[PDB]
Amino acid sequence: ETRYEKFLRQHVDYPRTAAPDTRTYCNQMMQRRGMTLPVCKFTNTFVHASAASITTICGPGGAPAGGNLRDSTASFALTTCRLQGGSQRPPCNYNGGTSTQRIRIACDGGLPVHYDRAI
Numbered sequence: 457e458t459r460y461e462k463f464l465r466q467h468v469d470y471p472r473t474a475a476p477d478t479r480t481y482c483n484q485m486m487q488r489r490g491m492t493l494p495v496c497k498f499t500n501t502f503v504h505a506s507a508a509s510i511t512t513i514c515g516p517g518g519a520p521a522g523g524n525l526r527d528s529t530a531s532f533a534l535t536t537c538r539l540q541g542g543s544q545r546p547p548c549n550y551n552g553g554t555s556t557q558r559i560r561i562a563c564d565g566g567l568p569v570h571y572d573r574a575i
Contacts, residue, residue, distance in 0.1 A: 459569045465489050467571045468510060469502040472533065482537035482550035496539050496548035501571055503559060504533035514563035521560055525572055528558045534574060 457465075466489060475481035491497040503510060509530070512518065518526040533556055540549040555574065562570040 459564070460567045463568045463570065464507055466491065466500060467503055467568075468505075468507055469535070470504050470506050470509075472502075472504040472535070478535060478552035478554060479550065481535060482552035483548075485535075486537055486548060486550055492546060492548040495544035496546060499536070499538045501559075501574065502535045502537070503571070504535070505530075510561070510568055511566075513559070513561055514566050514568060518561075524562045524564060525560055526563050527560050527575055531556050531558050534559070536574070 469485065473481065473485060475484060485502060486492050486497065486500060491500060509517070509532075510528075513526050513528045517530065518528050521527040533554070535552055535554050537550045537552045540551060557574040559574055560572040561568050562572060
């Protein structure tokens, strides 16, 4: 898996996957996307924009933010999932919120490789 593919798998959900509520969205998506084995990932943001929309952050669609970090020009629909309690052992239960925010990602060679935070 390329670092780019890992970024899409972990952080890109577009169009947004339908779910009954955000807790269920998080529970389903964290598992579907490979983030609950072998341990529960503590937190993860899904960005609801295309790979192309996010990739431009690394170039004309974003701005330098120190080191290899870039801030997006655009605000994006986001869902943020945070693990209930503190244990890495499954079962992995999540809570979640949604927002519309600019984002700060790490780029390498013009492509996204990590999600840093919402701005």
